[PDB]
Amino acid sequence: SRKTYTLTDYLKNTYRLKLYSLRWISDHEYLYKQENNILVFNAEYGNSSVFLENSTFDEFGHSINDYSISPDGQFILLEYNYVKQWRHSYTASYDIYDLNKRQLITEERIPNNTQWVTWSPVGHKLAYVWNNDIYVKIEPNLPSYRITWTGKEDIIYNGITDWVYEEEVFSAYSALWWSPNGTFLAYAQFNDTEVPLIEYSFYSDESLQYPKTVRVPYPKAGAVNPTVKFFVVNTDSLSSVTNATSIQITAPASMLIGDHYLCDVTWATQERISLQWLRRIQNYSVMDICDYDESSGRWNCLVARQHIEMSTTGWVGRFRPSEPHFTLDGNSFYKIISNEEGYRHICYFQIDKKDCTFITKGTWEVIGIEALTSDYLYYISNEYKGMPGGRNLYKIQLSDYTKVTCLSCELNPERCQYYSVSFSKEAKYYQLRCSGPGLPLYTLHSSVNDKGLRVLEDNSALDKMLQNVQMPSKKLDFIILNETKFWYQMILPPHFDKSKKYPLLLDVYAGPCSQKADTVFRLNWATYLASTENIIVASFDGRGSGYQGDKIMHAINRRLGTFEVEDQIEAARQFSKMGFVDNKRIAIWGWSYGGYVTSMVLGSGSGVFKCGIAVAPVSRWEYYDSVYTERYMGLPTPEDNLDHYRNSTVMSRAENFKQVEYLLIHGTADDNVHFQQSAQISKALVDVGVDFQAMWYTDEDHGIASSTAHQHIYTHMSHFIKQCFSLP
Amino acid sequence: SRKTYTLTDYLKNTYRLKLYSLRWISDHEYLYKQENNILVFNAEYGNSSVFLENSTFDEFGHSINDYSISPDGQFILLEYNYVKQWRHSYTASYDIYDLNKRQLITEERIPNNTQWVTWSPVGHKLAYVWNNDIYVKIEPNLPSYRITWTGKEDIIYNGITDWVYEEEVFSAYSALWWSPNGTFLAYAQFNDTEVPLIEYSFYSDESLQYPKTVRVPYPKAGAVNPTVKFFVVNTDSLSSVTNATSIQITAPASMLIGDHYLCDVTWATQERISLQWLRRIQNYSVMDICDYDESSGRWNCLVARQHIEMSTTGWVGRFRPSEPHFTLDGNSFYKIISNEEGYRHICYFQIDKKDCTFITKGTWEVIGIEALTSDYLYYISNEYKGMPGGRNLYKIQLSDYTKVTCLSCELNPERCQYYSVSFSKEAKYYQLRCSGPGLPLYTLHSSVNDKGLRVLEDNSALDKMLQNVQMPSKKLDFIILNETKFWYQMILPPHFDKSKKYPLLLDVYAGPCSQKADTVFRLNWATYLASTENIIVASFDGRGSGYQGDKIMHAINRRLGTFEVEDQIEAARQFSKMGFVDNKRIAIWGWSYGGYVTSMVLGSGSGVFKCGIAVAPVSRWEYYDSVYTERYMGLPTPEDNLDHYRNSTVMSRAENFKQVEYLLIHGTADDNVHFQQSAQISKALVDVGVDFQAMWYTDEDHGIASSTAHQHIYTHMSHFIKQCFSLP
């Protein structure tokens, strides 16, 4: 066809995927960003109208980052001056705008540097965090009622997470949860007094004469963790001339014996809070159901209705214990739980009753409970066809658990095998979101019929463009390594010939609960390596991987660095048993956990790999964070699992790296997997005679995310792959 | 047959130069280590006696780092437990041993972690620094007096230097100076209170979980400097119940007007100190000459005894104002001053007189004054043959300044063109120390007659070893740019011929006062590049270089990054004009200042250089230290020289590096030229799109000089020059 997908197209984004990201604002209405105008669309009858003329700029002159409308409709927040912190955390400035008047509130403004803002779910109350303390505005033009006073930089956090709870427990900076009608404000406080700092240099722009040492409370494996308290405040009874009153609700006594984590907060009703707790050995978990009591102000959590969850073989959850989806009445909930057969399935709990009824079953897993109605529960799963790498929407009839209906399986079954869903409020309308194996398809539905109303974006211009390109295909299949299936994918070059020997990259992540063999569509680096340079970029899911039952996933418990690494050698070995793969040209690469896994493969002495690349790798598990590492490994005490902590290091395999070419990459401002880890790889290689290639990225974080640095890292890695595979 | 000088032979140190490391202890005797038996030798007659046996000090329990015999012979310091700090500084443990008995001094011992130790010049007194304070010890067994109390880590340095005084002022961790007979002890005090810290990480062993942040008071260009005060204690009047009085000698009013340094301390007489100060703009210096009185104990410095040394065109000194050489009576002195013509020569000063009288002149420079008797002043110079990178010993009859006589020129004129000298006490004997261009040759001589007594070491065993190895030859010659001779050296391959086109490396330092073209013999990395791989390694001293007058040296004044860069490029243009060099295979490399000029050459755009390697380079003069930088640059203020601080960065040349292959190298614990400096080069290259090779070194300093990291850096660089020059 004359043309390929080049590296320049990946880095500059020539061939664009169009998304259809909408925010629901009611039970029937949503917002979309059509050009620079924000339109509201009525999802029943189809019609739309312009809500924001004046764009993305003009209301003060500032380029706006977000447009959060209050749920009653009367007000709007304009977010400006975004300053990224870590993965979810940021600071910004916040002007509140009156929509019934069309004018700015210059009375009692939210101060710049604000860490978090959230409207109450009803009305127009605000709660915001600023300087580690919570603030509450009853009206947006009236003074803030301050609510905590204990906040201090790097030490006490009220209403926002610390480093490790952000990245590793909640997946979020926020630690405010409102009651559904707006009355109570629940919040968690974190305490980082005795937690040790990672210290790293930051060089800044050229004019900064002395480097800044950036210092971050960060527990690594075995270290002193943070501590957690949990509170509730009533907002309707805040005194205008006295202090707020925050009633603590203490964690259950089976948690207070050790170090523990608060891992979930979901309000069941206006007067009921569900709270999951996790022991530091993350295989024992306790939910409290905590009702208010109007005669005392307090929160009682009767131990009878608390629900225990545990693991005798791994850890509770996929990363954390799963979220309960309550029924409206308060008195029951559904929750994803691993069953007796090993597989993760929906389970119905009744508030004062032990155990659960499994409402789903089989050799496959539920991914998430998406929406709960009077008569249906909607869920995504990988059930369809026996493929653990596809996603489809389902609905269980709650009066007859045998009446499950797939709502997305058959809509376009060759093009669309990987769905997600965004439901409106009360679940009246649902936007399906296909994302492979053909081009992303975005469609709107009503829940009454399951009939489709409109097609929101079909990716037509993306299609028409890509018919010029010699595009690669994806094989998706399995290999039976015992009796059990293990899944894989291959991006194969265009014009692929089974009687020709191609070079073979493994893309690797490989960590606990990962998935790399999937039906998703991607325009990435691997698309350039197959399209232009004729490399098969394959990828394997082995022992330790997710979405397939705990006999696969929990294979790696107390044993990181072993079977996820060894089955990746077996995957390359197996692909080279097939006769379209060159034996003399087999690279391996990953980022992060895959950087780690790549280095352990390179240092195993297998013979199979000529070269590899490790970007921002872990190298030794005592250098990475406590919450993640000890979830799988235990504690690095010799009463526990110190022997495997020490036996699983990249450093202790340094000797075998002279059999291989090696590129090591890392960002010097990595707040996540610190530059330490790569500094310890490189020193071990130096101390044993091996030669390798290195590349630091000055000031770049864990994602190596800057536009110039992203262009550079992939250009450098391309030249490494091409020299290794003998390509001009 | 014949083998070749390989990289393995360089690294493992196969062909070893024997030196002759003697140490004078009298006017007629020296000590020399043989087998860890230290022997004393008699100079005239040549006989020896074993003074310390190798088997003695096994019972001690430790491997000894140094021996230091007292000037009366009654004692010895045994230094052990060496722990390097910076270039000259260290911490140690010290036992004293009695040589009239044969036992250790058991009580009143020098503490552990002592920073510096020195005997008085006559006798057996001990001044030591520990915890930043001076302690005096009149007899080895008696309790130590405590001279100072103000000592404080990182802040107050009594009798030792802070960072910048160690590196750039004294070349020495020491800041004690005894009087010749031992009655007085003088000291500097540095005050680093407001000097900004520089911060960097230290990762340490694999077992260290959090990286430590090293912090060092370090004044960068323009930043607040340390201050200085100067003191003298009479150590024959220390009270056993009260503190020692320390009389402070104050600097001249013409130094106290702004910032300044104390740059030389020389005792002239038993009651006469010479002190030499330098303004922060280092083109003005004042020598005070301060006499004691027994009338009060004050030290009065007469202004009718001050001598001013200015510079009209650059800075005072080669690196600092030169050391004075007092005659015995103390009333007159000789020092190396720049004459009217710009060339450095010996000037005879008389104390009360203003002017000086030149004792030498010509088109060459005096390197050092090495001895002063009543009849002769002995000096090293480059006069011989017109060669600015040769060295020879001279003597200058003080009764007749035209009766100059070269003591070393004609000894072995083909083998020996680079000398140094060590005289005995009172200058009765001298060791000459030839360094090339043949194998090093060590000889002893008598001063009364200039008769050679013996050969001490001749490197006979190395010469036998090298007859079976194909060694490279060395050309040392000159080009003529703008009517001036500028010298170069070429290390030419074995069996070299005029007809082939050889690839050319260009080794560089290039800094102010440097000399990379000389007559000294070396077995180095360049010897392997010539021997095995057939690479001409070349070197050139352009403008800015020393030894050739101030018309060449002060060309670079205020102007670093300018003519020294231009002239390494023009030297490589010129070397291509000779027909034996491949102009598609020029490369460039240096270390430190040489990595700065490598970088400024590689980013010039000249077309000459295909590749190069900057190791631990400067990149911006505001990141390097104040004392060095501002010597040649002024202050980085817009009232001074800011504009040229900004024009002369590597970063502002980043876009042009797209034309050249590039390897940037740096060790992360470099306390001298910080890892900051390469980290801002790489940011600049990234933010502009240019690929480059990188290499870091975890915990290596400015030297990159561990056994493992020395093997690894030179192996990695060897790969880069081979693959650039297309060599297998």
Ligand SMILES: Cc1cc2ncc(C(=O)NCC(C)(C)NCC(=O)N3CCC[C@H]3C#N)cn2n1
């Ligand atoms: C699809 C899905 C669902 C889900 N639910 C939770 C998380 C989650 O908690 N993610 C945080 C995580 C990225 C694992 N933090 C650790 C981290 O960053 N690590 C670990 C070692 C290497 C390095 C990397 N990369 C991720 N998903 N994804």
Ligand SMILES: Cc1cc2ncc(C(=O)NCC(C)(C)NCC(=O)N3CCC[C@H]3C#N)cn2n1
């Ligand atoms: C021949 C000779 C004799 C001598 N006596 C003293 C000094 C001296 O004190 N020199 C300053 C020095 C120790 C090199 N510090 C500066 C330094 O290390 N720099 C400067 C920028 C790059 C980096 C390097 N390399 C130099 N000489 N030379």
Ligand SMILES: CC(=O)N[C@@H]1[C@@H](O)[C@H](O)[C@@H](CO)O[C@H]1O
């Ligand atoms: C910071 C803090 O709360 N420290 C408490 C202190 O108040 C108490 O007096 C002491 C002895 O009982 O115990 C500490 O843990």
Ligand SMILES: *[C@@H]1O[C@H](CO)[C@@H](O)[C@H](O)[C@H]1NC(C)=O
């Ligand atoms: C849609 O049309 C009806 C009026 O017939 C009404 O709901 C509203 O004006 C329109 N809504 C939107 C979002 O455009």
Ligand SMILES: *[C@@H]1O[C@H](CO)[C@@H](O)[C@H](O)[C@H]1NC(C)=O
């Ligand atoms: C911060 O708030 C101030 C009010 O103090 C406002 O004038 C300004 O626009 C805000 N943003 C910045 C970047 O200062």
Ligand SMILES: *[C@@H]1O[C@H](CO)[C@@H](O)[C@H](O)[C@H]1NC(C)=O
């Ligand atoms: C934070 O925790 C430390 C113990 O790590 C304790 O001393 C301090 O009192 C706590 N502060 C608050 C506000 O809870």
Ligand SMILES: *[C@@H]1O[C@H](CO)[C@@H](O)[C@H](O)[C@H]1NC(C)=O
């Ligand atoms: C509220 O209490 C805090 C102590 O937690 C105190 O510092 C503050 O003065 C009180 N505020 C008011 C308005 O009384």
Ligand SMILES: *[C@@H]1O[C@H](CO)[C@@H](O)[C@H](O)[C@H]1NC(C)=O
């Ligand atoms: C919200 O529910 C609470 C809890 O019972 C009740 O106190 C309050 O009256 C309700 N408020 C609103 C606005 O509905």
Ligand SMILES: *[C@@H]1O[C@H](CO)[C@@H](O)[C@H](O)[C@H]1NC(C)=O
């Ligand atoms: C949790 O894991 C540990 C470590 O493998 C094990 O000893 C313990 O029995 C497990 N189960 C519970 C409920 O603690």
Ligand SMILES: *[C@@H]1O[C@H](CO)[C@@H](O)[C@H](O)[C@H]1NC(C)=O
């Ligand atoms: C050298 O020999 C003479 C004569 O025996 C002796 O007096 C002198 O001490 C000896 N010196 C040494 C260092 O052995």
Ligand SMILES: *[C@@H]1O[C@H](CO)[C@@H](O)[C@H](O)[C@H]1NC(C)=O
């Ligand atoms: C210094 O301490 C070491 C122990 O590290 C000990 O062996 C030695 O005897 C001590 N030396 C002195 C002079 O106190």
Ligand SMILES: *[C@@H]1O[C@H](CO)[C@@H](O)[C@H](O)[C@H]1NC(C)=O
């Ligand atoms: C050191 O200097 C600081 C000013 O930076 C001053 O406060 C202190 O007194 C001085 N200390 C000594 C021992 O001179």
Ligand SMILES: *[C@@H]1O[C@H](CO)[C@@H](O)[C@H](O)[C@H]1NC(C)=O
């Ligand atoms: C000075 O000496 C007295 C004893 O006379 C002693 O107490 C004091 O420590 C010394 N001075 C200082 C500043 O330490």
Ligand SMILES: *[C@@H]1O[C@H](CO)[C@@H](O)[C@H](O)[C@H]1NC(C)=O
């Ligand atoms: C050293 O010279 C000084 C100054 O003249 C005098 O006070 C002292 O007596 C002399 N000491 C010795 C040991 O010669």
Ligand SMILES: *[C@@H]1O[C@H](CO)[C@@H](O)[C@H](O)[C@H]1NC(C)=O
């Ligand atoms: C020192 O250098 C400055 C800066 O170039 C120059 O203006 C001045 O004349 C010199 N000052 C002295 C005291 O020689």
